[PDB]
Amino acid sequence: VNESLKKFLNTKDGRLVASLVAEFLQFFNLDFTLAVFQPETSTLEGRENLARDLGIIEAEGTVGGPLLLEVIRRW
Amino acid sequence: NESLKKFLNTKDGRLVASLVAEFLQFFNLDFTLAVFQPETSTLQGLEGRENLARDLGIIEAEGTVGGPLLLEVIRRW
Question: What tissues contain this protein (chain A)?
Fold first, then answer.
């Protein structure tokens, strides 16, 4: 277990960040990466709950990319 | 994976993916990175943390150095 990561995952913003990374991997079917990510991180919030948490209203313009894209697009 | 290739051929997409890689590097998720790179065809590596911070207008300080760059992005979202 990763202690710096454990503490991070136990923060509000940390959980959101990790959930966004996992959602990115899922979005591009990076399934081998996910197979290692899950045990290496000891792990999160799925896309619907995550979009709500991030104040992102899902629509035609958002469904075609990972949620992190909407954040960066509007940065 | 044409969807990812097209995504990485956009400025915003390359920034997103670079931020994900930086998160993996920040937490020493080295085996995850070892699979991420071939799976995304980014064996040469994406843009570095300070390149990304410059792009995003983030100034490194005691309050940013202690977390991955995505932490600062999400704090400020």
Answer: Ubiquitous. Highly expressed in heart, liver, muscle, kidney, intestine, colon, adrenal gland, prostate, testis, and pancreas.
